[PDB]
Design a protein around this nucleic acid. Structure first.
Lengths: 40, 39, 221, 49, 216
RNA sequence: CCUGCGGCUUA
C-alpha cells in the first residue's frame, strides 16, 4: 500500500557518526554561527 | 512458634500479554521496513 | 499457654536481642535460566571464573548458623531476631516464627528464592516473616541495644556472667563471620564492645550455639 | 465508520484484530465520497475497531 | 595428646550419633543417600523418601571439629546408623568443610571404612561394629538426650561427675525417630531446656557446658 | 490493573 507523511526517522550509529564527523569539521575549521552585537 | 511453610518453587492472560508484545515488535519492524523501502 | 510474641524490630522496648551474621557468600549467580548460588566444590569453571577463592567463598556458613540458631531454646522463648548483612550489602531481618531446613539444598533453594524475590510468605497468608528493614540492622533496630563482637581474640569470659549483668530492656547483639581465613572485623564498627567466649577458634554456628546456651541460662531462657 | 469526532473518525468492519491494524499504521484510506485520510492508531478492547 | 577409645582409664567424652542416614546404592558407581539428587531411587527400591537426612552427621562433625573441647582432644565421636555400622573419630580429625567436598569423604568412608588421612599418618575414621560400651572407660555413665527426663543444668550434672567417670552421650541426629534407639545402652536421660533444641545444637550446648564446668 | 522501550513466537 502507500504512505501519507514521513514520521519519526530512526537514527543509528551511522547517522550519528555522519553528523559527528561533520561537526568535527564544523568546529575543526572553527566556522561558527552567532548573534552579532550591534553598536550604537 | 507458629510454623510457616516455605513457599518455594490457566493459560489465558499471559497469552494476551505476550500477544500484545508480539504485535508491538512486529509493528515496529514492519513500520521501519516499509517506511525505509518506500522512501 | 501460648508462645512468646514476634521478636523483631517491632518488639523494641520489650525483651529482645539480635543475632547478626555477616561476611558470608550470599548472592544470586544465575547459571547460563534460574538463580543459583556460589558453590566452591560444585562449580569449578564458574567459581574460578567469578574471581572468588575456594577457601574464601563460603555460602553454607549462613545455612549452618541458621540451623544452629533457629532451634535455640531462647528463640522459642521469644528473645532473638536474625540480622544478616550479605556480601552484596543486603540486610535481611528474620523473625523466629519459622525454622529453615538444615538441608543445604532446600535452604539454598529458599535463599535463591529470597534472592530472586526479597519476599517470603507464610502458609497462613498472614505473616510475611522475611522483613527487610532500612539497611543495616542498626538503622531500624530496638531503641535500647547492646552491641559487642564475640571474638576468639577478644577477652574470653563466661557467657552467663556478662549476659546476666545486662539489663532486660537492652538488646545484646553478636556479630559472627565464619570465614575459613579471616578476622573478627566484619562488624567491628557496629559493635560497641569486644568480648570473647571460647579459647579456640570456632565457626559462626559453634559461636552462635555457645551464645545461645549462655543466653538460655542467663535469664532462664 | 461508527463514531465520528470533528476531523477524526472511528472505524469498524475493515479489520478483525489488533495486529492487523498494527501492520498498517500509516496506510491511506480514502472516503468513497472522496476526501483523503489515513489510519492512526488501534483500539484494543474493541477487537477490530 | 588425643583421648581415644583404647585408653579406658582417663575419662574421655564420647558423643554417639544415632539414626543418621548413610545409605548407598548402585547407579554404575556407588552413590550415597541424597534427598535432593535422587528422588525415584527411594520411591522404587521400597523405602520412603523421608529417610534421606545425610547432612546431620557432617553437621555434627563440623560442629564438633573446631570446638574448644575438641581442641583439647577430649571428644571422641562415635556414630551408629540403621545400616549396622559404627564410626569412630578422634578430635584431631580434619575433613573438608564443604558438603560437596564432604560427599567425596562420605563416599570414601562408605567404600573403604578406613580413611587414612591425606598426610598418610593416621586413619582418622575407624570402622567398629556393635557394641559401643567397650569404647568408653570401665567407669562411665551413659546419658540419652530425651525430653522425658526433667531438664537439668549441664554444669550441675557435670560437677557431680567424677574425674575418672567417663561420659558417653547419645545425640539423635534423625529428623524423625524415637529416643529409645539405645535405651538398653543408655543409663540415664538428660535434658537441655523446656523449649526446643536440635541435635547438633544439643552437642554444641554440651560442649559449652563442658567448657564452663571444665575450663575448655 | 491499564500502559511507553527491551526476550521469544505465531496461522
Amino acid at each position: 500500500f502507500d504512505r501519507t507523511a514521513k514520521p519519526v526517522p530512526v537514527i543509528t550509529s551511522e547517522v550519528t557518526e555522519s553528523l559527528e564527523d561533520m561537526i568535527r569539521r564544523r568546529i575543526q575549521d572553527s566556522n561558527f554561527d552567532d548573534l552579532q552585537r550591534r553598536t550604537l | 512458634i507458629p510454623t510457616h511453610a516455605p513457599k518455594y518453587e490457566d493459560r489465558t492472560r499471559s497469552e494476551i500479554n505476550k500477544m500484545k508484545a508480539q504485535l508491538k515488535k512486529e509493528r515496529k519492524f514492519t513500520m521501519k521496513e516499509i517506511r525505509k523501502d518506500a522512501k | 499457654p501460648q508462645a512468646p510474641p514476634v521478636l523483631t524490630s517491632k518488639d523494641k522496648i520489650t525483651k529482645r536481642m539480635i543475632v547478626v551474621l555477616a561476611m558470608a557468600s550470599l548472592e544470586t549467580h544465575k547459571i547460563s535460566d534460574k538463580y543459583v548460588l556460589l558453590n566452591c566444590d560444585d562449580h569449578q569453571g564458574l567459581l574460578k571464573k567469578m574471581g572468588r577463592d575456594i577457601s574464601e567463598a563460603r555460602p553454607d556458613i549462613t545455612h549452618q548458623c541458621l540451623l544452629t540458631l533457629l532451634d535455640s531454646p531462647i528463640n522459642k522463648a521469644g528473645k532473638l531476631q536474625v540480622y544478616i548483612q550479605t556480601s552484596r550489602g543486603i540486610l535481611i531481618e528474620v523473625n523466629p516464627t519459622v525454622r529453615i531446613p538444615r538441608t543445604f539444598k532446600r535452604f539454598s533453594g529458599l535463599m535463591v528464592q529470597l534472592l530472586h524475590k526479597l519476599s517470603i510468605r507464610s502458609v497462613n497468608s498472614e505473616e510475611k516473616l522475611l522483613k527487610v528493614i532500612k539497611n543495616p540492622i542498626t538503622d531500624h533496630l530496638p531503641t535500647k541495644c547492646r552491641k559487642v563482637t564475640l571474638s576468639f581474640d577478644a577477652p574470653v569470659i563466661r557467657v552467663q556472667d556478662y549476659i546476666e549483668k545486662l539489663d532486660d530492656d537492652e538488646s545484646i547483639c553478636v556479630f559472627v563471620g565464619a570465614m575459613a581465613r579471616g578476622k573478627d572485623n566484619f562488624a567491628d564498627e557496629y559493635v560497641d564492645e569486644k568480648v570473647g567466649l571460647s579459647n579456640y577458634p570456632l565457626s559462626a554456628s559453634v559461636a552462635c550455639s555457645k551464645f545461645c546456651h549462655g543466653a538460655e541460662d542467663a535469664w532462664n531462657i | 465508520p461508527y463514531k465520528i469526532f470533528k476531523n477524526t473518525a472511528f472505524i469498524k468492519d475493515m479489520f478483525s484484530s489488533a495486529m492487523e491494524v498494527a501492520r498498517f499504521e500509516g496506510a491511506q484510506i480514502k472516503t468513497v465520497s472522496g476526501i483523503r485520510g489515513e489510519i492512526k492508531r488501534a483500539l484494543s478492547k474493541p477487537e477490530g475497531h
